[PDB]
Amino acid sequence: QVQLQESGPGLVKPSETLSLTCTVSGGSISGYYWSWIRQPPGKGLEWIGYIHYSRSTNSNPALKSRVTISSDTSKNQLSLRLSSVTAADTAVYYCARDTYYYDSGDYEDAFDIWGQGTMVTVSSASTKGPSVFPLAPGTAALGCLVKDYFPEPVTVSWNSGALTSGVHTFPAVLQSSGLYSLSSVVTVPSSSLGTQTYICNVNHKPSNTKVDKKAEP
Amino acid sequence: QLVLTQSPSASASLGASVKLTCTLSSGHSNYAIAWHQQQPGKGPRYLMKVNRDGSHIRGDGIPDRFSGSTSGAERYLTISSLQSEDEADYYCQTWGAGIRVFGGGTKLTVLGQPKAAPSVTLFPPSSEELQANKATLVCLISDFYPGAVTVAWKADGSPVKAGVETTTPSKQSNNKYAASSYLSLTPEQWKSHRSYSCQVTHEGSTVEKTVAP
């Protein structure tokens, strides 16, 4: 039941310092190394560095001049600071639980729990919340069109997370404006069209936009 | 220099086995590795550790269809009884002095899944969007396999090329593919035609849907 949760801003400007935290729950950060990892869109995993609260910290030689990793025992948190960012630092950032060191000083190599990841975009463009439009309807499709937001991502649930079936949220398209759009769709029985209501819950964390939209006949 | 070499892709049929390979650089041929799986759209999860002596230790909850083995500098992940959900990127990873490194990842394709024709739904611009003085036609393409389609848009029956954005098909929760195509128009253009058409070609067959203002 140990879980890891990354957090930080979704948007930073070039040359700024990216600051992320990794909050551990269900267990202590004591005794373990904790690693930071990142993944540019469509690319592989890159190890950034690691920290053990009472042993050492280190980082990838390509990033060491810009990487500072630390820990906070009271908050049961690890942190990553990456300075002088550029577009090359746009990536999803992860933490992971790494090798455990016993009091004897011996250890067992591990890399067994990942966080969910947090998406960071490095850009000078301003945040923009989406506009949400319903896609109105023995089976029928309905959806929501989530238009003109920045940066990624938006999440779409249906009926406050209580609808989990024919739901599909598509990859976003990057429009020439530099803004993203996506749609989320659900396939529902035609008989429940005059009966059940369908509301998409759209969240855009970088603008703290929250929108509920009913898709009705 | 510690390097883990993975070839970028592997392929095998539904129900078969596949053996993915991760090669350690020569100075590190006795290292243990970990295998990580990243299904499309989600974060990585740990699969197992593979030890120098050939033993392996699966993570909690990882199916026993996944096993690991060793031969010299080679580290293997064998997946038996391949299922659609095994299509994923597989990364090996190891531990060095003050360092961890990942292989480049191997994308596994599971071939021979059941064929499925797409279901197409074409949505006209919403009244809300038109009231905002914009217009998007949304062509939703669902539940098809294999995951490749082409989309053709028409106005009244004449091909429309400009303002089309189509996503790359991605896997749905039911392991069939979906895709979306958007045609951007002005409200006046939308209202000026008799109809617009979205035509989807899939394995040499076409499915077409029409909407009118």
- Single residue among B112, B137, B171 that ends a domain in this structure: B112
* Helix (H/G/I), strand (E/B), else coil: A206: helix
Tokens of B204: 């040499």
Experimentally, how was this structure solved? X-ray
Q: Are B122 and A126 in contact (CB under 8 A)?
A: no
Q: What DSSP string describes chain B?
A: ---EE--SEEEEETT--EEEEEEE-GGGTT--EEEEEE-TTS--EEEEEE-TTS-EEEPTT--TTEEEEEETTEEEEEE-S--GGG-SEEEEEEEETTEEEE---EEEEEE-PPPBPPEEEEEPPPHHHHHTT-EEEEEEEEEEBSS--EEEEEETTEEE-TTEEEPPPEE-TTS-EEEEEEEEE-HHHHHHSS-EEEEEEETTEEEEEEE--
Identify the residue among B100, B138, B173 best suited for mutation to test binding to A, counting A beta carbons within 10 A and taking the highest.
B100
Min Cα distance B139 → chain A (Å) is: 10
- Single residue among B74, B96, B112 that ends a domain in this structure: B112
Q: Answer yes or no: do B100 and B201 share one domain.
A: no
User: How many residues comprise chain A?
Assistant: 217
- Taking any CB pair shorter than 8 Å as contact, residues of chain A touching chain B are 35, 37, 44-47, 50, 56, 58, 60, 92, 94, 98-99, 109-117, 131, 133-136, 141, 143, 145, 147, 167-168, 170-171, 173, 175, 181-183, 185, 187
Q: Answer yes or no: do B57 and B152 share one domain.
A: no
Q: Answer yes or no: do B201 and B103 share one domain.
A: no
Min Cα distance A75 → chain B (Å) is: 24
Interatomic CA distance for residues A155 and B185, integer angstroms: 26
Resolution in A: 1.7
- Asked if the C-beta of B99 comes within 8 angstroms of chain A's C-beta atoms, the answer is yes
Phi-psi region of A103 (alpha: psi -120 to 50; beta: other; left: phi over 0): alpha
Residue type, A8: G
Q: Answer yes or no: do B95 and B138 share one domain.
A: no
- Single residue among B91, B112, B133 that ends a domain in this structure: B112
- Structural domain harbouring B139: 113-213
Q: Answer yes or no: do B74 and B164 share one domain.
A: no
Q: Answer yes or no: do B72 and B26 share one domain.
A: yes
Q: Answer yes or no: do B118 and B163 share one domain.
A: yes
Other CB atoms within a 10 A radius of the CB of residue A50 amount to 28
Listed in order, strand segments (DSSP E) in chain A are 3-7, 11-12, 18-25, 32-39, 46-52, 57-59, 67-72, 77-82, 91-101, 107-108, 113-114, 118-122, 131-135, 139-149, 155-158, 168-169, 173-174, 180-189, 199-204, 209-214
Q: Answer yes or no: do B106 and B118 share one domain.
A: no
Domain with residue B135: its CATH number is: 2.60.40.10
User: How many residues comprise chain B?
Assistant: 213
Q: What are the structural domains of chain A? A: 1-124 (no CATH), 125-215 (2.60.40.10)
Q: Answer yes or no: do B106 and B152 share one domain.
A: no
Return phi, psi of residue A179, to 5°.
-105, 155
Q: Answer yes or no: do B106 and B1 share one domain.
A: yes
Q: Answer yes or no: do B171 and B202 share one domain.
A: yes
Q: How many domains does chain B have?
A: 2
Q: Answer yes or no: do B106 and B142 share one domain.
A: no
Residue type, B118: P
